[PDB]
Every structure is written in C-alpha cells, then in structure tokens.
Design a protein around this ligand. Structure first.
Ligand SMILES: [Cl-]
Ligand SMILES: [Cl-]
Ligand SMILES: [Cl-]
Ligand SMILES: [Cl-]
Lengths: 114, 114
C-alpha cells in the first residue's frame, strides 16, 4: 500500500515527460517555465496569482521527492492550469492552449493504474 | 479566515447550479445522476471505478455540509470527470461531453474569489 505510491509517482513523471514532448509543444510552451512577471503586461500577476506554478517547478519537485503521492502532483498541475484560467481573459489564446494541455493531463492521470 | 470558507462554499453551490442549468444540458446530462450499473454494458463499471460520483450526490453533499472547503468540493467534481475519462474509450461521445462540462467547471472554479 505504498509500493503503489512509488509506481503512481513514476507514472506522474511519465505524464510530465509527455507534456514536455514535441507532440504537445505547440500549446504546452507557455507552461514550461515560471511566468515572467517582469514582462510587459504582467505587473499585476503576483497581485492575482498567490501561488504560481509551472512544469519545470513540478519537474524539480518530483525529482526532489516533494510530492507524498500522485494526488499532490496532480494538485500542482491543476494549480498551474487554474492560475492560467484565473489570470487571463476567457477568450485569450493562452486559455485555449491550457485547455489542450489539460486534455493531455486529465486523460493520462485518469488512466493511471491503482 | 473561515468566513471565506463559507463564501467559497456558497460559490461552489452556484457553480453546481450552473452545471445543472439548461445552458449546459446538452452535455451535462450524463453526469446528473449516478451511473446506472444495472444497464447493458456497465457490468464492469464497479470493477474499474472504485469511487463513483455524480452531480446529484455532490449537491446532497454540499447541502449536508460534507465538504470542509471548496477544495473538497472540487475534488469530487474532478473525481466525477476522471471516472468518465478512466472508464470510457477516449473517442467515446461521453468523454467529449465531460470535456465541455469540465470547461464550465474549471473556468468558474478558477475565478472564484479568495
Ligand atoms: Cl515589451
Ligand atoms: Cl506592464
Ligand atoms: Cl438494453
Ligand atoms: Cl452488460
């Protein structure tokens, strides 16, 4: 009942690897690294988003064993997406990209064995 | 720091109400009530889905104050969607419907004040 935790965390690494792969690069790229809050237009980002998250941070957290289980991993992925939905206008091209990427994540995360 | 919990749970009720509304009825209807495991084709449902969830159950749980916070509410909504993604073939019409409905949920849940 904890070797399963180890195998699910292994799947999580596999999911994140696919999210980084060329296959999804057309819509994943806004999520690879932390939002650059120094960029023009992002002067209010930290006002609105209390807990920023991105795929490289998630990768480092997996590697530093900072997730107790797959559920904690999934919470950070969903936090990343919700940050995008919260901050941006609903017709923003980046929201559509988040949706395509969340598609990949939800399907893989759901089909993960337990 | 707990009157906010009360207001977020109020928003959750509002989100679920919208999910039940005519506006989304074309794709929400598979999710209104528990999956009927007596129906033809569903003889393996309980084998695959250890924790069934649906919108009417979520509604009753809100009303019976069974969610400590919005995060617990959101977990049951996401459990409902992941159950659909886990059980069904990825090209199944119901998966597409879950996606449209999860669209509604994620956008509202993200824009909820805190
Ligand atoms: Cl610029
Ligand atoms: Cl700016
Ligand atoms: Cl029949
Ligand atoms: Cl059957």
């Amino acid at each position: 009942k904890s070797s399963k935790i180890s195998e699910q965390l292994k799947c999580c690494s596999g999911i994140l690897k696919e999210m980084f792969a060329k296959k999804h690069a057309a819509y994943a790229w806004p999520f690879y690294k932390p939002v650059d809050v120094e960029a023009l237009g992002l002067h209010d980002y930290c006002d609105i988003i209390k807990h920023p998250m991105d795929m490289s941070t998630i990768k480092s957290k997996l590697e530093s064993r900072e997730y107790r289980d797959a559920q904690e991993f999934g919470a950070d992925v969903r936090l990343m997406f919700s940050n995008c939905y919260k901050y941006n206008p609903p017709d923003h091209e980046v929201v559509a990209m988040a949706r395509k990427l969340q598609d990949v994540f939800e399907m893989r995360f759901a089909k993960m064995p337990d």
